Design a binder for this molecule. Structure first.
Ligand SMILES: Cn1cnc(-c2ccccc2)c1-c1ccncc1
Length: 123
């Protein structure tokens, strides 16, 4: 384990770009980290966005979030070739970054209080 609840991280999931997240405890498993069915470590994250969502992410797809300007360094990990940025997606990413920049100014306990999602079971 390298991340704990309330840590700010970037996650690279599915078809999405590196995205600002907060590590959190899964509402059902009550753990923020686990070993998956392939034997690899995963972390439970919340995506910062206008659309609240969560996911289990392979440790190789998680990075410490030091600030929004780190995005360039993450693209460097992979003429220069750049993927274009789709409009709706860029708008949600900018919202997520604005929240992550606000969260970076808080303590870990403050972030946990401000951002941990409330989960409501389908009735
Ligand atoms: C970056 N990202 C990777 N997966 C998701 C996602 C997960 C489950 C359902 C839907 C999307 C998102 C995302 C989440 C919220 N806002 C923007 C992107």
């Amino acid at each position: 384990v390298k991340f704990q609840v309330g840590d700010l991280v970037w996650s690279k999931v599915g078809t999405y770009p590196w995205w600002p997240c907060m590590v959190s405890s899964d509402p059902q498993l009550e753990v923020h980290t686990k070993i998956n069915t392939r034997g690899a470590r995963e972390y439970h994250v919340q995506f910062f966005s206008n659309q609240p969502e969560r996911a289990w992410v392979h440790e190789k797809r998680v990075r410490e979030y030091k600030g929004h300007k780190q995005y360039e360094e993450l693209l460097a990990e992979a003429q220069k070739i750049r993927k274009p940025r789709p409009q709706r997606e860029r708008a949600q990413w900018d919202i997520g970054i604005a929240h992550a920049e606000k969260a970076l100014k808080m303590t870990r306990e403050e972030r946990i209080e401000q951002y941990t999602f409330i989960y409501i079971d389908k009735q």
